[PDB]
Each structure stands twice: as structure tokens, then as C-alpha cells.
Chains A and B, each alone.
Chain A
Amino acid sequence: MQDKLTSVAKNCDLTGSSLNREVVETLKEFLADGEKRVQVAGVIGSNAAEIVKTAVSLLFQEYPELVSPGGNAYTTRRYNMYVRDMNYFLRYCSYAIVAGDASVLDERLLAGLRDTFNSLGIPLGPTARSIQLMKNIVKEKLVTAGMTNITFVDEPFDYVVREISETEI
């Protein structure tokens, strides 16, 4: 996996344009938000359990059939698996927020995720909904902490959804 700086530096040699003006501008823009990325990751790590618990409770509110008999969140075994996987998603999204690059998600979260979920019958719609709920809760916590320009926080979660959701149109 790579972070933003590593990918940009390697692309500098790959593309043959070296350290031109556009690369310098993108590097400066990225470095301007680095402290905010670290702060966002700190907030996510300090409130991980609360975020996951809130998101899973809201998911079971919006999908009451999940916890009913025959549902996928039926029994504490599957409930614990739900919580565990949502923690996985939150952890790797925090990693991607720090790195500024989505390669960590590609290599350690999304590679083979669809195969696993098809094998185990894990529904993807509720998975995307839970990721979006976690994203909303993280945004609420960041607004509470006083952060202002936190658009990049949307990038991992949304991206993950786009990678796991099926094609409808």
C-alpha cells in the first residue's frame, strides 16, 4: 500500500514530467490538510466503539427484519460478526483518511471482499447502509469537535460503497 506522498513521488518519475507545477500544487494542497487528517483519525480512534455501536443500532432500526428470525443479524453470533466487520470498515477508513490514498482500502479491505460476502451470504445493501451510517456519525462527531473543512472524510466511506455495491443503472 501507498500513501499520497509516495504515490505522487513515484508518479513523478513514471510520467516523465518530474516535479512540475501541477505536482507541486497538488502536494501543497495535500500537505495543507495533513493536520486535519491526523485530527480526524484521532477522533475516529478515540470513539470507534461508540461509532460502530450507534451505526449498527441505527442499521437494525432501519432494517428490523435483520434481527428477526431468518435475518442475517439473527443470534448473537451474527450480531458480533456485524460489529466486528463494521469495526474493520471504520479502521481501514481511518487508515485511508490518514494516508490520503485509497490503496490501503484496495489492498486490505476490498480485495476479495465480494467473494467472501457471496460465499457467506452477507447482504451488500445493509453493508453499504452501515458504512454510510458510520460516515454520518463520524461527520457529526467531527462537527462537534469543531472541524470545518472535512470534505475528505467523505472520500473513503463513499468510495468503499461504490466498490461493494452492485450496478443498478
Chain B
Amino acid sequence: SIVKQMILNADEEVRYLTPGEIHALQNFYRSGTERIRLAKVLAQNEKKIVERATQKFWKICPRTPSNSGNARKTEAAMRDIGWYIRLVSYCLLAGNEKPLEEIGLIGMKELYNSVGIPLENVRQYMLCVKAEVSAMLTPEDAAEVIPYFDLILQVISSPGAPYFQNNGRTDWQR
């Protein structure tokens, strides 16, 4: 959380929190009710967002482990997406991205390499999830929540799309 980060920074330098850090903490405390409301909103819309995002993702990328005819793989993919939405809600509550980093971002690429899931498929799935979250939430709620999904995407966005050394045609598949 932000309070934990301030305390760790102060303890590293062996000093009490400065007045500015205390004022930032007070602002964070004052924003707590709105943060909790946003987290509740995200929690209540988890299942429908996941379902719609899965539909869009299967429409986009069919050649995926979650669309290989295995029910276990489909359940696991939907569960992973729900987990990432849950971590984003944790970030909303905590005031920073540390829950996301410490639960689902550090080592995420290594985990998916070991499990066997292509990370571009994960990126496309998360883009679909971000689109669904933007569609469902109000513009303010989206403006507050989407940055964490963009933070997730930034981890698994390189190397990859876009590609510009082409003629722009996508029908070359044959």
C-alpha cells in the first residue's frame, strides 16, 4: 500500500515521515470511501466482464489453449482473468500497484512460459478485458481503473504488436 511504501522509504533513510508524506497519507485516507466504492463496483461486475471478454477474445484469437476444446483449460483461463481483475481491485484499495506487482506481475512471464500459455494470447485477452471494463464502468470509474489494466499490459507488451514492416494486409493466411 501507499502507507507501507512511505513507511519503508522513511525507514530506509532512518527518519520519521516528512510533513509532505504525512499530507499525502492524509489525502489517501480521505479518498478511502471512493476507493472502496470503486472496488465494490469492480467486484460486483467481475463475472459478466469476464464472460463478455472471453467471448470477444475467442472471436479474436481462436487458436488458444483456452479454445482448444478442453474444459479445464477454459476454466483456468477464465479463473486467471478473474484473478487479475481481483488484483486490480486490491490495487484500487491499496492506493498503489504493489498488490498487483507482488501477486501477479513479478514472475508472470516466467510462470506463463512454464505453464505453456503464449503471452501474446494473454495480452489480447487482457485487451479484451480492458475494453469490457471501459464499456461497463462510467467514464470516471473507467478513468480510475483502466490505468491498472494498462499497467498489466505493459508487462507483457514487448516484443510484439504492432508490426509496421508490411503492406497492411491481414488475409495472407492460407
A interface vs B, CB < 8 Å?
42, 45-50, 52-54, 57-58, 60-61, 83
Q: 24 A-B Cβ contacts within 8 A?
A: A42-B147, A45-B147, A45-B150, A45-B154, A46-B146, A46-B150, A46-B154, A48-B154, A49-B153, A49-B157, A49-B160, A50-B157, A50-B162, A52-B158, A53-B158, A53-B159, A53-B160, A54-B162, A54-B164, A57-B163, A58-B164, A61-B165, A83-B158, A83-B159
0/1 string, B55-78, CB within 8 A of A gives 1 = 000000000000000000000000
Q: In the complex the two chains form, is B158's CB within 8 Å of A49's CB?
A: yes
Q: In the complex the two chains form, is B154's CB within 8 Å of A61's CB?
A: no
CB A71 to nearest CB in B, in angstroms, measures: 15
Q: In the complex the two chains form, is B147's CB within 8 Å of A53's CB?
A: no
Q: In the complex the two chains form, is A60's CB within 8 Å of B165's CB?
A: yes
Q: How far is the CA of A8 from the CA of B10 in the complex (A)?
A: 26
B residues near A46, Cβ cutoff 8 Å: 146-147, 150-151, 154
A residues near B146, Cβ cutoff 8 Å: 46
A residues near B158, Cβ cutoff 8 Å: 49, 52-53, 83
B interface vs A, CB < 8 Å?
146-147, 150-151, 153-154, 157-165
- The A interface is mostly helix, strand or loop, or mixed, namely helix
Q: In the complex the two chains form, is A57's CB within 8 Å of B147's CB?
A: no
B residues near A53, Cβ cutoff 8 Å: 158-162
A residues near B159, Cβ cutoff 8 Å: 53, 83
CB B160 to nearest CB in A, in angstroms, measures: 8
B residues near A54, Cβ cutoff 8 Å: 162, 164
Given contacts A42-B147, A83-B159, contact A49 B154 (CB under 8 A): yes
CB A110 to nearest CB in B, in angstroms, measures: 24
B residues near A58, Cβ cutoff 8 Å: 164
B residues near A57, Cβ cutoff 8 Å: 162-165
A residues near B150, Cβ cutoff 8 Å: 45-47
B residues near A42, Cβ cutoff 8 Å: 147
Q: How far is the CA of A60 from the CA of B151 in the complex (A)?
A: 27
B residues near A50, Cβ cutoff 8 Å: 157, 162
Q: How far is the CA of A65 from the CA of B171 in the complex (A)?
A: 29
Q: Which of B150, B158, B163 has the most CB of A within 10 A?
A: B158
Q: How far is the CA of A52 from the CA of B150 in the complex (A)?
A: 15
CB A89 to nearest CB in B, in angstroms, measures: 15
Q: How far is the CA of A61 from the CA of B147 in the complex (A)?
A: 31
Q: How far is the CA of A60 from the CA of B158 in the complex (A)?
A: 17
CB B140 to nearest CB in A, in angstroms, measures: 14
Q: How far is the CA of A50 from the CA of B123 in the complex (A)?
A: 13
